[PDB]
Write a protein that binds this ligand. Structure first.
Ligand code: A3P
Ligand code: A3P
Lengths: 248, 248
């Protein structure tokens, strides 16, 4: 059966794909593309026209930011067994885009714009970079409560970025355990292999070799703060999920 | 049954997708995304997780630069009925990349590099922009002589960019006819709707609306000319196909 590491953009997908990869190898991650090798990002494979077999006879780990109901995933309708659903504070993802796009904390105009757009979009829908990811809630809902509308044989484990941070080895082991990947000894090591430090290192090595790669809201605030809290406490699905996952 | 407009990159794919679209509508192409609507580029749909049904009961036009044997296309193995295979002078595609990437005819260093790479790659394989397209010959071979290795029920029509230029209405009608799309009256109009002029117009209108978008070898020459002719007359498959399609 087939398994998805599903995550909205910026939720820490690379990080967790890193750990899972190193846990399966038990060997560190020597090279940035090593991550795409271990837990392929679906979008990456489709870009070069790869597309893994529907119903493998042995367990397979894939990752994606697609919402769970994008047509392309329909090929995996019956074979999808399990889904780790990686979630992080929507406030932080928004801040994340900002660092991402360039933009120091100062250029308010720049950032105010992105934040207002984020807010009316309830997530990244207007951002050219990703596609078929939906709004934060759309995406999460799709991989969780309504997961069975796309993958009827599917069990799901939600994991919060924030929880992985507080305690990487406990949380990861929960994912390992869930995925039936093995022991717990591997977990300690695997965690270590993928550290802000390691990841930055592992990253720029490969960049240099010529290889393929990639606070809070006070500043800019007063009213961009007001618009957020107003959305973060509405009757919408964004607010629902922010409440449910302790971003409230 | 299902139909592919297959073309290496730079062979004039947009242009022909334009005409085919306007022939089916009989209405001009009002808007640049109108092209993706009429004859969707496969890669585009996969990027947002669309992916059209294997075996439609009614005829369907798709386009791609993938080589015909990329895994992803395997879903269309039995349903693929027909394949228009758009080809142009490999010399011109190389020149095309150059205009594409920026680069005025002068910056020899810039262009010499790209050309030498093109030559050792026999086409665009090292260029980040496209993926799973193969080298020129790899690609063409895959959609033509070996087409049945991927799509066993498939008939193919090759059409040269150069021929479409010399005579757009005759050549297009050949594609129309082949594809069993209808008359010949439509052809005259359709041709007109998509003209270097029209296409540039249709293009920048949409850019401005905030919409999604996109000689010979003497200069730089003497030796980059020698390297080319040497390849263009080798025992390789590139030279084979250059010979076969009158680029010889
Ligand atoms: N080894 C690691 N440990 C913890 N967090 C990491 C990490 N590697 C990357 N991250 C953070 O995870 C986010 C990447 O998101 P994704 O991989 O889902 O696109 C980034 O958020 P920030 O840029 O806000 O810190 C990144 O900094
Ligand atoms: N309406 C039209 N008629 C003829 N040629 C066109 C056209 N629109 C675009 N082209 C040419 O077709 C090529 C586009 O390639 P593709 O669409 O396969 O990527 C470009 O080659 P040049 O840039 O060398 O002229 C482009 O200029």
């Amino acid at each position: 059966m087939m398994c998805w590491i599903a995550s909205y953009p910026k939720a820490g997908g690379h990080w967790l794909r890193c750990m899972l990869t190193s846990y399966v190898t038990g060997e560190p991650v020597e090279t940035w593309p090593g991550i795409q090798a271990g837990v392929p990002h679906l979008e990456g494979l489709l870009r070069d026209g790869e597309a893994p077999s529907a119903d493998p006879d042995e367990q397979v780990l894939l990752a994606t930011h697609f919402t769970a109901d994008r047509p392309v995933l329909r090929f995996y309708r019956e074979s999808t067994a399990k889904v780790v659903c990686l979630i992080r504070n929507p406030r932080d993802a928004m801040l994340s885009l900002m660092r991402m796009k360039g933009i120091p904390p100062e250029d308010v105009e720049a950032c105010r714009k992105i934040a207002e757009t984020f807010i009316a979009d309830e997530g990244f829908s207007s951002v050219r970079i990703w596609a078929g990811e939906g709004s934060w809630p759309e995406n999460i809902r799709s991989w969780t409560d309504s997961v069975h509308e796309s993958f009827p044989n599917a069990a799901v484990l939600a994991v919060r970025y924030e929880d992985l941070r507080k305690d990487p080895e406990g949380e990861l082991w929960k994912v390992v355990d869930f995925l039936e990947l093995g022991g717990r000894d591997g977990v300690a090591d695997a965690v270590a292999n993928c550290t802000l430090e390691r990841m930055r290192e592992m990253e720029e090595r490969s960049k240099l070799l010529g290889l393929e790669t990639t606070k809070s809201l006070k500043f800019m605030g007063d009213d961009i703060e007001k618009a957020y809290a107003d959305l973060l406490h509405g009757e919408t699905d964004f607010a629902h999920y922010a409440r449910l996952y302790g971003y409230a």
